[PDB]
Design a protein around this ligand. Structure first.
Ligand SMILES: N[C@@H](CCC(=O)N[C@@H](CS)C(=O)NCC(=O)O)C(=O)O
Ligand SMILES: N[C@@H](CCC(=O)N[C@@H](CS)C(=O)NCC(=O)O)C(=O)O
Lengths: 236, 236
């Protein structure tokens, strides 16, 4: 019963000792960031999915912005903005550190994130565009932005922060996952490193574990395009 | 000779052992963030101002975005985006920590920063607006955003991160400094805490030390509005 909560739903009880809770939506790439970090760190947690068309009134008490993801810990603290939530999880929980100890590498990873920053909007505006015109230009935009990542980051290692997967990879992944799902892999045909990086990413056990199937993505997508409240719950 | 560097200028030499260098502009509030942190931490540094109308070609090698601020350390590393530069300085240098040790407080400070995020654009669009219409609406916008900071942050202490000044205060200050300079203090007449916070901010030795005088701001502003390359160098 991972079915989303909507208007009229009971405000949830307090997050139990030993857990953290994520307010999420199954097809939200921003929330995927958080879930990737949760999984990679082996963090014990609860998921509550939020129906984004039919939002529970109590949800604006969780995040004044009314967006997912939001973390709520067992001390009743609330954290929103996907990047903030990922950084918090890495700092507050034991195990493999996803952010490097070194201040420059940390900074460089945030600089990479900033290079990637145009992509999410391009992806949303693609899904939500129906004119032959806007496809052509959006494609050009994809090319431009992907070369930025390819050329400006000057990756020499398998992943964006070095030889092992780390925060920066998990931060950008969801939109590359979506790119594939949208059959847009050819947008990275001119960017050899980025292209290889995608293949390496899919071999990662955490990335692998959180991939959404073609079936489920398409199911969400259909209902999303019909502006249906049931889109969030596709595939059950 | 803090005169800005422009097209044709010699690319600067390597940053000397024992120093960090900031690529700046005297009337840039984003760069003010960095300079505030430099001062608060007592960090030994160089300033090189960049003429933003007449940019040195070599400057895009410092930051592909061609924006200030940029840090360059004596190991030849480059850091851009004001927030990234401030966080790096705090991590990489000794003394008073401006960010709290605790992961939640860190996160909360970033959440505050996100609440403030609409303000810089509103300020720029005010300076650069000449229609009676756009003043009225921009004023409304100011009110709206300031109540967000007032109401959503629910400050109970003198500063945004507690009883002492810290990163979050220095991050948002430049635009409140600019608000005053633009004679817009009345935009915070409905926000008592924010209003008191401004007074407390001006008592801080670092904030105090970096205030730009009414004279100099107006001098920059006049020439900025004439789209003059000499705007950066006003007051000598
Ligand atoms: N900047 C936010 C964006 C989060 C976001 O946009 N989430 C979407 C779903 S992917 C949302 O909650 N939308 C509901 C709405 O917009 O009303 C983040 O990084 O977390
Ligand atoms: N997001 C950037 C914005 C920096 C920025 O906009 N700086 C301006 C001056 S305040 C700039 O360099 N403008 C030159 C230009 O736009 O061409 C930051 O946080 O550092």
């Amino acid at each position: 019963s991972a079915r989303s909560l909507g208007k009229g739903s009971a405000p949830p009880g307090p997050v139990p000792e030993g857990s953290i809770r994520i307010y999420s939506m199954r097809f939200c790439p921003f929330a995927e960031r958080t879930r990737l970090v949760l999984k990679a760190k082996g963090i014990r947690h609860e998921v509550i999915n939020i129906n984004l068309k039919n939002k529970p009134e109590w949800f604006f008490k969780k995040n004044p912005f009314g967006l997912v993801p939001v973390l709520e810990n067992s001390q009743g603290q609330l954290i929103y903005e996907s990047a903030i939530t990922c950084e918090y999880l890495d700092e507050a929980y034991p195990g493999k550190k996803l952010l490097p100890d070194d201040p420059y590498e940390k900074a460089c990873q945030k600089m990479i994130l900033e290079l990637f920053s145009k992509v999410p909007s391009l992806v949303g505006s693609f899904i939500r565009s129906q004119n032959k015109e806007d496809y052509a230009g959006l494609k050009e935009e994809f090319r431009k932005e992907f070369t930025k990542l390819e050329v400006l980051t000057n990756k020499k290692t398998t992943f964006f922060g070095g030889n092992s997967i780390s925060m920066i990879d998990y931060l950008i992944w969801p939109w590359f996952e979506r790119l594939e799902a949208m059959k847009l892999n050819e947008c990275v045909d001119h960017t050899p490193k980025l292209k290889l990086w995608m293949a390496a990413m899919k071999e990662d056990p955490t990335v692998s574990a959180l991939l959404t199937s073609e079936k489920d993505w398409q199911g969400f997508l259909e209902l999303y395009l019909q502006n249906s409240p049931e889109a969030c719950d596709y595939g059950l």
